[PDB]
Structures are given as C-alpha cells and as structure tokens.
Enzyme design. Structure first.
Site, PDB file in Angstrom:
ATOM      1  N   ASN A 127    -125.593  60.676 -57.947  1.00  0.00           N
ATOM      2  CA  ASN A 127    -124.239  60.612 -57.401  1.00  0.00           C
ATOM      3  C   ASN A 127    -124.233  59.637 -56.225  1.00  0.00           C
ATOM      4  O   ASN A 127    -124.643  59.982 -55.117  1.00  0.00           O
ATOM      5  CB  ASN A 127    -123.790  61.998 -56.926  1.00  0.00           C
ATOM      6  CG  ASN A 127    -122.389  61.991 -56.337  1.00  0.00           C
ATOM      7  OD1 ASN A 127    -121.661  61.000 -56.441  1.00  0.00           O
ATOM      8  ND2 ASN A 127    -121.997  63.107 -55.728  1.00  0.00           N
ATOM      9  N   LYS A 184    -121.760  58.585 -54.668  1.00  0.00           N
ATOM     10  CA  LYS A 184    -120.661  58.902 -53.766  1.00  0.00           C
ATOM     11  C   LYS A 184    -119.911  57.600 -53.469  1.00  0.00           C
ATOM     12  O   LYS A 184    -119.801  56.750 -54.355  1.00  0.00           O
ATOM     13  CB  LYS A 184    -121.192  59.588 -52.500  1.00  0.00           C
ATOM     14  CG  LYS A 184    -121.957  60.871 -52.854  1.00  0.00           C
ATOM     15  CD  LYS A 184    -122.296  61.741 -51.652  1.00  0.00           C
ATOM     16  CE  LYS A 184    -122.934  63.043 -52.131  1.00  0.00           C
ATOM     17  NZ  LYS A 184    -123.296  63.963 -51.016  1.00  0.00           N
ATOM     18  N   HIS A 218    -117.092  68.983 -56.713  1.00  0.00           N
ATOM     19  CA  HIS A 218    -118.146  68.686 -55.750  1.00  0.00           C
ATOM     20  C   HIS A 218    -117.714  69.276 -54.407  1.00  0.00           C
ATOM     21  O   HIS A 218    -116.522  69.300 -54.088  1.00  0.00           O
ATOM     22  CB  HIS A 218    -118.355  67.175 -55.616  1.00  0.00           C
ATOM     23  CG  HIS A 218    -119.574  66.808 -54.829  1.00  0.00           C
ATOM     24  ND1 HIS A 218    -119.611  66.843 -53.451  1.00  0.00           N
ATOM     25  CD2 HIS A 218    -120.820  66.466 -55.232  1.00  0.00           C
ATOM     26  CE1 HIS A 218    -120.829  66.541 -53.040  1.00  0.00           C
ATOM     27  NE2 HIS A 218    -121.584  66.310 -54.099  1.00  0.00           N
ATOM     28  N   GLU A 259    -117.755  68.207 -51.441  1.00  0.00           N
ATOM     29  CA  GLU A 259    -116.961  67.305 -50.624  1.00  0.00           C
ATOM     30  C   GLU A 259    -115.488  67.319 -51.017  1.00  0.00           C
ATOM     31  O   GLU A 259    -114.610  67.200 -50.158  1.00  0.00           O
ATOM     32  CB  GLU A 259    -117.554  65.898 -50.709  1.00  0.00           C
ATOM     33  CG  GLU A 259    -118.792  65.752 -49.832  1.00  0.00           C
ATOM     34  CD  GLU A 259    -119.793  64.750 -50.362  1.00  0.00           C
ATOM     35  OE1 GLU A 259    -119.403  63.873 -51.165  1.00  0.00           O
ATOM     36  OE2 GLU A 259    -120.975  64.841 -49.960  1.00  0.00           O
ATOM     37  N   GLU A 274    -125.409  73.288 -55.603  1.00  0.00           N
ATOM     38  CA  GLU A 274    -125.651  72.508 -54.402  1.00  0.00           C
ATOM     39  C   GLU A 274    -125.195  73.305 -53.196  1.00  0.00           C
ATOM     40  O   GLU A 274    -124.005  73.339 -52.885  1.00  0.00           O
ATOM     41  CB  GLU A 274    -124.871  71.191 -54.415  1.00  0.00           C
ATOM     42  CG  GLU A 274    -125.240  70.209 -55.499  1.00  0.00           C
ATOM     43  CD  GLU A 274    -124.815  68.794 -55.135  1.00  0.00           C
ATOM     44  OE1 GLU A 274    -123.633  68.600 -54.772  1.00  0.00           O
ATOM     45  OE2 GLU A 274    -125.663  67.881 -55.201  1.00  0.00           O
ATOM     46  N   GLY A 290    -126.905  66.206 -47.550  1.00  0.00           N
ATOM     47  CA  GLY A 290    -127.053  65.190 -46.520  1.00  0.00           C
ATOM     48  C   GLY A 290    -127.669  65.642 -45.211  1.00  0.00           C
ATOM     49  O   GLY A 290    -127.666  64.892 -44.233  1.00  0.00           O
ATOM     50  N   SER A 333    -130.166  67.298 -50.863  1.00  0.00           N
ATOM     51  CA  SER A 333    -131.346  66.696 -50.261  1.00  0.00           C
ATOM     52  C   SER A 333    -132.528  66.572 -51.213  1.00  0.00           C
ATOM     53  O   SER A 333    -133.677  66.765 -50.821  1.00  0.00           O
ATOM     54  CB  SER A 333    -131.764  67.474 -49.008  1.00  0.00           C
ATOM     55  OG  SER A 333    -130.776  67.352 -47.999  1.00  0.00           O
TER      56      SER A 333
END
Ligand code: NA
Ligand code: NA
Lengths: 250, 250
Positions: free
Chosen positions: A9, A11, A94, A96, A166, A172, A212
């Site tokens: 991904n 992003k 996701h 985010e 996740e 991150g 990560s």
C-alpha cells in the site's frame, strides 16, 4: 496451504511517471516466486500499473472505491472503472479512511459489495485503536468491526475476499504487533469467518497482518499459522525493500 | 474580456477505455474555438486524458485533490500526482463532497493551496441550499462559504483561480438559476474577490455558473456580464451535448 500475499500500500506517494520507472524495474528484477505480489498505488497510477504489470506475475489494485456503482458523486471512483483497469484488489475500510473520512462499517460493507460484483477482491481492513487494546478489548472490538463490515457481503468463494488486520497503533509507528499477538487475532478473525461463511470457506481466506511490517520482522510474522501475508505500508515504497519482502515470502 | 471556460464535470461515470474513445472523438470533431474547453474525469481516467488531449486545445483536470502534499493518506490523490499528469484544473469543494464527505471551508482552502503550489487552477465551488435561497439569504450564505474557502489562499494571479457558483438546488434537478439570479450572485462574488485580492485581480477571475447547464439555457446564462462560463454536469456526458455547449461558447 493458503498462498501468501504481499500487498504494498503506497498510500499517497509517487507520481505516474515515477511509478512507471518503479514498475519497470520490478518487472526486470522480479524472480520466480510461489507467493503472490501486488502493488496498490493511488488512482491515477493504475493505468501505468496495468500497462507495465499486466503481463507479469505482479497484480495491482486500488486503495479505496465508491459505495455506488455510478452517479453524481464528484471525486469518487467506481468499481467498474477499477475492473476496466484489471485491478485484482482494492482496499476498503483502511484505518486512515475510517478515521479521516468517517467511513463506517456499513459503508465499508457497501464498498466491498461493489468490488465483489465486478470480480475485484476486497482487502478489508479491521483493527483496534491503542485505547481499546490497553483496556483488553482488542478482540471483541475487531470482531465487531469485522462483522459490521461484512454485513450483506457474500463473496463467490474464499479467493474473493481478503481480510487485513492492522492495529491502529502499529501503523507508521514502528511498533508492530508481536507475531504471537497477530496470530491470536487472526485465529479469532478466522473463527468469525467460519461462523459467517462456513469452515471450508474460512480455512481458505487469506488474512494479512499490517502495521509496521518490514524486512526485519516479516519472516517471523509470516511463520504464524494464521498469518497469510502482509499489507505493507512504508516498507513498500522502496523497491529494494519490497523485493526483500517478496523474497522472504518466497 | 474574460475568456469563457466550459468545464465538463463527468462525476462518477465512464471507464478509462470508454474515455479514450470519447476523447479521441472530441479531438477529431473539435472545431476551432475562442473559448476554453476542459473535461474533468475521475482520477483513473486522467492518464488517457493526458495521452489523447495533450496536443489539443482541450484541457483537463481532477474532481478533487488531497489537502496534504504527500503521506499516509490511503485513497487520497496529491496535487503533485495531478501536476505530473498535466492537469490544468481540479475541482475543490463541490457541493457533493461538502455533503457526502463533510468537507469544510477550511479543508477546501487547504486543497486549493495544494493545487496552487503545483500550478493547478482550483475550480472552487460555492452555493446555497433551497431553503437559504427562499429565506433570501443566498448571497450572505454563499459569500461566507467563499471567504472561508479562500482563507490563506493567495494565487499568483487571477488566471490561477476559478470560482464556480452552483446553487445546490440547481444540481441534477433540471432547474437552473435564471440568468438574472446567476448574474446577481456572480456580481456579489466578484465584489468579494475584489475586497480580497483587489479590483485588477477580481476583474480577471473567471466565475462559472453550474447547475443544470444545458444547450437550451447556456447561451442566455453566458450572455450575463459576470458569468464567464459553466461547470457542466450531466450535459457533459454525451459528446454531442458537450460539443453543442462549446459551439455556444464560441
Ligand atoms: Na503463515
Ligand atoms: Na458572460
């Protein structure tokens, strides 16, 4: 055994011109592998992904998709647009987007349905925030999110659905979940899938771990019986890193 | 005078393969015109727009853009990606996104800033709902939206900013604002732009009208002194209709 899937991904990174170079290098360097590789770039990069990768063993997909088939939804991209480009996958829900765009379980389910109708495999993301994890509610929270996000979702087969666990606190931050904790969550997720679609189906669904993931921890994560690959973020941006992850998968 | 701009917002319609045909037909059938034409397709269609329309007089652009330059924003598209593709424009703050995606004036302002930094002209949309219009508060409401959406937005020149006035009640409803009402609103908007950027700047900014624009009403709308073109929705989907609008613009 379930075939491993390593999905990168990117992003919001790179441009179409930079992506063309990246994909061409991947094509030239890609060694023969048993596992499956896929890159998930931003929408405008999908055409060059199709152009350069269509004839290779590397698949590609989107990072989001509209809950509608077509219409007056300025800025949204439809599943039909993605299938025209040959996308094998598309991320839905996701963290985010659930956080920055207020996407609900119900919306994620609709997006998944749009993908299924077009033969695209959703990579449905679920995962708990740090606060929930600290309270000891990681499993109940994640399962509730999973069930809500699969409402009305009936794939043709297990090959048509991918779940990605996740944990939000692992995105991150450099703080990945330990292989053991990932394994425990995947076991719970798979049991929930068995109740939802039957054991035959659930035993074949690929459940990826994300958060990560990098060359230094991927092997151990992948060694877990219920971890079928990874949804890789930052470590998928550099070609050498992505290739290293693919070699680990084999 | 201000050069007319006819921008077609396809919203969520067509596929890259269908667009290739459409763009190629437009290229072959396009007569020489004084006004400016632009098509704004979904993100994955931008590459073929660049390919086919590159050498032509027709420009293209996006329907949305990220408020961030780059980063961990799964699903979002950056201004740099759009710049790489040669986009001349990008819509920001379309009423559909303000409603369905809860976009705020502050967010729209950031999106506009990202576009300016990359040399892309924002097509900033502002407009009021029916009840506000009936309460006689269309202007105050719209101007407040304009001011909030332009906070911190400082284009290099008037050529780098386009405002689109689209009454929410005129979108896809078939009821366009009367030339008189559009003119009145555009005058208020231009005056606001003058206070914000000065008269020289404001007198050169293209203010487009949007909301049920079609071959039957475009000529009269365009005849108004402060209406510099149109942001066309449904009437931009069929090539014959789009061409008709371009011929009207001249
Ligand atoms: Na495994
Ligand atoms: Na005019």
């Amino acid at each position: 055994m379930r075939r491993v899937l390593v999905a990168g991904n990117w992003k919001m990174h790179k441009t179409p011109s930079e992506a063309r170079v990246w994909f061409a290098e991947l094509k030239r360097l890609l060694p023969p592998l048993q596992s499956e590789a896929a890159v998930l770039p931003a929408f405008p990069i999908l055409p060059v992904a199709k152009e350069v990768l269509a004839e290779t063993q590397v698949g590609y997909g989107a990072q989001d998709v509209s809950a509608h088939k077509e219409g007056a939804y300025t800025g949204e991209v439809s599943a039909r647009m993605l299938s025209d480009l040959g996308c094998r996958y598309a991320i839905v829900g996701h963290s985010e987007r659930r956080r920055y765009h207020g996407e609900t379980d119900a919306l994620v389910a609709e997006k998944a349905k749009r993908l299924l109708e077009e033969g695209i495999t959703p990579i449905l993301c679920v995962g708990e925030p740090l606060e929930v994890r600290e309270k000891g509610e990681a499993v109940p929270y994640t399962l509730r999110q999973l069930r809500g996000s699969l409402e009305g979702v009936e794939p043709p087969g297990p090959e048509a659905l991918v779940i990605a666990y996740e944990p939000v606190w692992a995105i991150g931050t450099g703080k990945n979940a330990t292989p053991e904790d990932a394994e425990a969550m995947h076991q719970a997720i798979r049991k929930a899938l068995s109740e939802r679609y039957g054991e035959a189906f659930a035993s074949r669904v690929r459940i990826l771990y994300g958060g990560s993931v990098n060359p230094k921890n991927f092997a151990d994560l992948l060694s877990m019986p219920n971890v079928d690959g990874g949804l890789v973020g930052g470590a998928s941006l550099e070609l050498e890193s992505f290739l290293a992850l693919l070699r680990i998968a084999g």
